Amino acid sequence: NFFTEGTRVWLRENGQHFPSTVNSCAEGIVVFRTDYGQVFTYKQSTITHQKVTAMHPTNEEDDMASLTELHGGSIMYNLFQRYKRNQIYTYIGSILASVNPYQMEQYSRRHLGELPPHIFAIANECYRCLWKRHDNQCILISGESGAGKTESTKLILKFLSVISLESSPIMEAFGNAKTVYNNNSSRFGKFVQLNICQKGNIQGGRIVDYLLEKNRVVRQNPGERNYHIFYALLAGLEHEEREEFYLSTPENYHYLNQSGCVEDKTISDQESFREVITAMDVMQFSKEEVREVSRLLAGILHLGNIEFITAGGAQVSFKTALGRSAELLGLDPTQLTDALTQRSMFLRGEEILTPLNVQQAVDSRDSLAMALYACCFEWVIKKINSRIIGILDIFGFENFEVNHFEQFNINYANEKLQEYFNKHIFSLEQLEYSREGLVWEDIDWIDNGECLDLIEKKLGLLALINEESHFPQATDSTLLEKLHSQHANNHFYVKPRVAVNNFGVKHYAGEVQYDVRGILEKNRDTFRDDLLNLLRESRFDFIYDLFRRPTVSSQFKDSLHSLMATLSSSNPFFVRCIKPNMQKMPDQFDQAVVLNQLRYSGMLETVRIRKAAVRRPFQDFYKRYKVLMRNLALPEDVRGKCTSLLQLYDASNSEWQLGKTKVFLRESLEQKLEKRR
Amino acid sequence: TTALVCDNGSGLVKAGFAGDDAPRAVFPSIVGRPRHQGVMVGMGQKDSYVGDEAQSKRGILTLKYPIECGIITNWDDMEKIWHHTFYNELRVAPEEHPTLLTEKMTQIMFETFNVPAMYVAIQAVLSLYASGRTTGIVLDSGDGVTHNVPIYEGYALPHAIMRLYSFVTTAEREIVRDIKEKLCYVALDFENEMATAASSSSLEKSYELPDGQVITIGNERFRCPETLFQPSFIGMESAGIHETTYNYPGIADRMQKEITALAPSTMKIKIIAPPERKYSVWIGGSILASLSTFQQMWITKQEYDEAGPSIVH
Amino acid sequence: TTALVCDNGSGLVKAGFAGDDAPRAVFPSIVGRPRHQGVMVGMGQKDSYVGDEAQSKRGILTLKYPIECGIITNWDDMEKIWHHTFYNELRVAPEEHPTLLTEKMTQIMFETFNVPAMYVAIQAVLSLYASGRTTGIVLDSGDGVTHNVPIYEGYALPHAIMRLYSFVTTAEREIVRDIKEKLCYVALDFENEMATAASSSSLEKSYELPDGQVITIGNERFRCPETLFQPSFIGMESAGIHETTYNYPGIADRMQKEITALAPSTMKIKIIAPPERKYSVWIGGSILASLSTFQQMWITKQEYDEAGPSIVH
Amino acid sequence: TTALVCDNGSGLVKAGFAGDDAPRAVFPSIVGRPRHQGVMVGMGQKDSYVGDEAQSKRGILTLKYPIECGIITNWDDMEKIWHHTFYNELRVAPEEHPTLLTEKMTQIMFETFNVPAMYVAIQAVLSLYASGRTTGIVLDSGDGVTHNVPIYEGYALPHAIMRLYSFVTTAEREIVRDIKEKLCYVALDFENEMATAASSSSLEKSYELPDGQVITIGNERFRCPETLFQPSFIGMESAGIHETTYNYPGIADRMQKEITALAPSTMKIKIIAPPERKYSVWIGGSILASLSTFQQMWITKQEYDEAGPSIVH
């Protein structure tokens, strides 16, 4: 394991392989200098036989899968060099990795592989396969917002338009929100079906939306905001309309203040308003309908200020919040105040009014707010679709220090998407081995069905959550214990030793720890029918135009299943967008951020699966292992020379094979040969 | 493909699928044969009307309740209730679901209707699942068997429960029940109220009876329900629900003033009783069979060829 | 990275890191299984409540003390005490520290919890480190084993130590203990006090019981604790603490007057006992493992590979 | 001039003079008031029937036991038991003798009936005087308090004793007791006996009830008494007589096989229990007051003017 001064090596330190150079090797001490500027010193005796792997035909300068040692450090280094000191691309098998940085004819008609990686190459393959297979295509653009997903969508669409955006401000206003880790994060999946006629010319588009984070409408964690649109509305409305809807600053609203977001600057919120209003005009929303959208949002804001007094059961005792809400929605004050505090049932055939408690009233109020928002959101999408190869803009795995119900849903969605991806790749692999390579049988390895089951199957995490929610004395604490009682004896499911982080799920890309706190309340979503009937009865025409125990988690499950049906009925193409640095710096590659991004987008695990595996050109193999052939009577041809050595290790010819240009061998055989070399 | 929660009381039988509101179908649970000879062709007339039509055509029948004080009288009529209900009402197949009952039944319905599983939850316990509390003593009294079950969180104490104008014709008795419905109220202080009741001031409200007759009842209007406490009036010695708990627009604060006198001092006693209470039990069952995970505490058919009549408990 | 002084008594188990005040966590040290069958889904209900919840939900359990009169009964409950405590309470890793215990334990805790070292100091000795005296005879009496260890400066004499309304239900016994708490006092001259106790003037204080009941105990209120001296009342021959020393708001001048009668004359006897005594032992332990230098009188892991079950003493 | 040994149990009160056989008079010890209004002149009807007539005329009464689980409920009824017994039964004057009672009583009986002396011996101890042994642990269990008192020769250890079809109406309960009498037997190996109990072969004997009704009880016939051990069935935590001893045609080899499994090995355990046992205690008392010499451990008239309410113990 000794390497001379200047040798290029991989150093497996702290759990990651570092691209390094041997700085010095004297007095039994070895010093390594990494390409990231770190200096590591060791006793030469402690440097074990790999451990330190030498840079096999280095390639210090289009597809990551072509790397022989296919691990984290290699992926990070290769993406880095291409991005910083080489033209940006890059492929990871079928996946197109796109790294954000500094702000058609040639691709048209070409094959996927003949051209340098580019969003156009993916767009072309999709256009291609669409006509060839007579089959709908999906281009799944994953990664966190800001990573460059809208640019990828823009150019895929620009491309399809050629060879054959105005709504963005709208969708961001209602679908995006500032989280702790991202100022403008999409909290829903957007699928823009680019429609083509019989002659493959673009005729229009149809937006479908999934996975809307309903919980955010009524709850925000510290340093997070509700959907952008609320802040945009409050910052952008003119004095006259603001006064008409009884609106003041965001601090005055329970649905906007509870988080503790410092923010200070409206300015961007005011710009976002201008942008939304312009987009809605393009989208053919009438002045009247826009004002109705804002009246409904303002209604949601005032609704959330409604306070209940625990008279025992409860009652509304306040001149406002409710008065303004009833005025905006055009519903009777007493009829609304009554239904906010009571539940209706009819029995053969008389009405039975039962009082609600304050906690039930609050939950019902929130469910109403979420219901109104979700339907308003759907109404707006209907309008966009009316005005106007599906491009899915979806988030990757989301992992903060403190993970709740929101992240759990996101990661659940990613497990489902990853299953589709894995099955797709495994299918492409069988086909490549059939037509590409002769072989008797093929087996697929890496099913994440178990993780998906742990999440969505009966007695799963979400199911138990629904269960606990319908029990009157249920709590996050008892739900935690039900999780442990049900799963601690199985799964991908772990519990923190000191009950600080709460349950952990071994997801596809990594273990995530979720805190149980808030899961029950966020999951509750039982809207009261009588409250909705009151709303249905009033009109400025928009409000009514919205036409056991329902929970957010179950609705998320349903929406996710709807999304997968839409995707599964197409042929998927994958683009992973990563944010290379946290400061919007032009062509700047922060290794810490990049590593996190690549992992979150499933790339690193996809690489590990692909790596599962060793191959070298005949001469490369012969030149590396020539030492091991000293005592053999070798033939004149290189293929024969490789065979001579390999036959000693496995005469059955099963642990190795000779291809057209390369020697293929199992990891175990390579490990055996290397140790001996 | 749904599952069905069906509660048999001496009611007013209630039926409706696994959630989410109230029974789809409610009716008085009676079979009545025609006590006379019929002569208007067809032959037309049914051998026996079940509810609800048997509650629409009184006077030409002899009402016979299939159950009576908890134990049912005979499954010959009960089965007919069932078959009639499942087949010609809810329009539900027999193999649709595993069913859930409250309390020969299990077996007869098992061989006839072939519901591939079974589970029987007690009528009292379910009454907690209404407002979704975990603790409490449940006082469930319906025609014609009441019960008093104390449950702690979350296990349940089993042994601490103690279970207690001419209108001659059977059919006509139904009308009496209706005069029980509207024209009723439990006093707060019976003994002092009885004196002033004699005063000319009408504490009497006049109800009108399905024919022509107008009947004016007072006094006894509040006396009759009072029987629930002080059940000497019937000639039964077992003391009132009042005392059995410790051991109508009147309740619960009647129950309150009665208890606080019998209960120990310095103890706060909420007597919480919802509106909508008539369906409380059912709102229980829906919550139950829809909930994970006690589905695996059922008894399906494969497990009924081994033990059969046993294992149910 | 801290070290933890954890004392197992028949308490009231006490736990808190290497100083400097009092145990972070104190609880009655009981496991109790539910004597009934549970039916409120989830499965929800725990197999057994450890403290403290097993002291909040009495009556639905059968309290079983894991230790009893010094020797513990079974480590099946004991280990569960431990695991529950370290993992879901103090939020401390098992490899965090070398530990300090007072008196199968050492070993089970060694293989399960893997605290890389160990040391067990006797419970009497630690009680001197409170007020930081070096000399004296220590009378340490807690549920359910007392001891009398005489220590001089600074060595310790080994051989001079001598070691001594219906309330049927197990759970309810806890309530008795509480009436032991507040309603108690040791007389100064019992035999003469008993006469005047019969006088009508109430030396009785009326305590109120968790349900409604109001209980009025007198006389015996001071009789019961008096059992501590003159334990003929129990039917045990070993003479009272009174005599075992030489050989409650009552003490120490009870103890005083009593000893001075048995003790030799012309000897001054301070009977100094702090306030805050309930945590005395613990304030001892904290001082010890934090102090230099007896860290090297420990038994770490490498030295448990040689001898094992021995060497602990 | 004779002396009378009279034992009050929750029986079955027994009375008969100072020897030599069995009580002259035995009756179920109940008073029962008529729950209805009487209308047959005289006035004819008694204000309340005491036994035995109150056991001949059930159903027209509400039976009320004057004593209940050891402590009596009220001396208003008890005194009537007494007066009725002494005056209209045994034909005995009140000043006839100094009396002997087993266990407000002593005093009321002293001022009303003026028996010039008194002495009260505990109910357990007397059970040794039957077959006239001096040693042994006595398990004396009658409705409604059992006790376990161990006595050596001849002093007695005080502290080693541990003290543990619709049939709604009270009167009818008597009949239940009678079906307990004849139709009962304790198994030898219960848990295994239940399996074969399910076999069709009737371990059921059919008893006939005072009216027409014929009642056929099986299984539970041997289950009910078995409750004596394993009293979880009742919902009481205190373990069975089985364990309380160490700590019906069934016993004693049930008791035997049970103890030998719990008892230490290599120990011979005779479980001698006489026939005629129902009067054992009484055959005790007779021997006592007739025997020299404890007559001078009595409390007479002169010695009740000094101390009174005390001194009885």
Numbering used by the authors:
A (entry chain A): 3 to 63, 66 to 107, 118 to 178, 198 to 421, 430 to 588, 607 to 671, 674 to 738
B (entry chain B), C (entry chain C), D (entry chain D): 5 to 107, 118 to 178, 198 to 280, 306 to 371
From the publication, what sentences describe this entry?
Class X myosin has been found to be localized at the tips of filopodia, which are plasma membrane protrusions containing bundled actin that are necessary for cellular processes such as cell adhesion, migration, angiogenesis and the formation of cell–cell contacts. Myosin X is required for filopodia formation and extension. Myosin motors move along actin filaments via a series of conformational changes in the motor domain that are coupled with the sequential release of MgATP hydrolysis products, Pi and MgADP. These conformational changes in the motor domain are amplified by the myosin lever arm, which is comprized of the C-terminal subdomain of the motor domain (known as the converter) and an extended alpha helix length that varies with the myosin class12.
To complete the assessment of the angular displacement of myosin X from pre-powerstroke to rigor, we performed cryo-EM on actin filaments decorated with the motor domain of myosin X. The resolution of the reconstruction was 9 Å, which was sufficient to resolve most alpha-helical elements in the map. The orientation of the myosin X motor domain on actin in our cryo-EM maps resembles that seen in previous cryo-EM reconstructions of several myosins in the rigor state. Comparison with these acto-myosin rigor structures show, however, a substantial re-orientation of the converter in the rigor myosin X cryo-EM map. The three short α-helices characteristic of the converter fold were directly resolved, indicating that the converter assumes a novel orientation in the rigor state of myosin X to within a cone with a half-angle of ∼5°, as assessed by rigid-body fits performed on a pair of independently refined maps derived from separate halves of the data. This analysis indicates that the lever arm extends toward the pointed end of actin nearly parallel to the actin axis, thus differing from the orientation of the rigor myosin V lever by ∼30°. Thus, our cryo-EM data indicate that the architecture of the converter and the SH3 domain in myosin X are specifically suited to extend the power stroke when entering rigor, compared with structures of myosin V and other myosins. We modelled the myosin X powerstroke by fitting the actin-binding components of the pre-powerstroke structure (upper and lower 50 kDa subdomains) into our rigor cryo-EM map. Comparison of the resulting pre-powerstroke and rigor conformations of the lever arm indicated a net swing of ∼120°. This magnitude is substantially greater than is inferred from our X-ray and cryo-EM4041 models of the myosin V stroke (70°).
